[PDB]
């Protein structure tokens, strides 16, 4: 058991270099831009004619 | 009568303007209030002074 374990833990290990690579991917700081409008009036005033 | 025509015009037909003021009021500052009446409570904390 203590060289199979060894061996277990042994071949495990790749695996979590590939897990923490995603990890560190997963904490890259992206991002884009939001932009809006808007608009408000307001009558002046009016005659006949 | 034809003494007082210019002053007449002067008087009234000039006046009109007068009653233009209250076209555009009726027209849209409580004609466009539509709004208002439709809108849930939490909004009237905001348009009664808008």
């Known amino acids: 058991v203590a060289n199979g374990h060894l061996e277990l833990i042994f071949g495990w290990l790749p695996l979590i270099?590939?897990?923490?690579?995603?990890?560190?991917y997963?904490?890259?700081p992206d991002l884009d831009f939001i932009r809006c409008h808007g608009l408000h009036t307001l009558v002046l005033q009016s005659t006949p004619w | 009568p034809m003494l007082?025509?210019?002053?007449?015009?002067?008087?009234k037909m000039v006046g009109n303007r007068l009653g233009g003021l209250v076209r555009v009021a009726?027209?849209?500052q409580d004609?466009?209030?539509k709004r208002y009446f439709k809108a849930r409570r939490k909004?009237?904390?905001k348009v009664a002074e808008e």
């Open chain 2, 4 to 11: 007082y025509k210019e002053r007449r015009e002067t008087l």
């Open chain 2, 26 to 28: 009726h027209a849209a």
């Open chain 2, 43 to 45: 909004d009237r904390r």
């Open chain 1, 17 to 24: 270099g590939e897990l923490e690579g995603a990890i560190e």
């Open chain 2, 31 to 33: 004609r466009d209030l």
């Open chain 1, 26 to 28: 997963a904490e890259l």
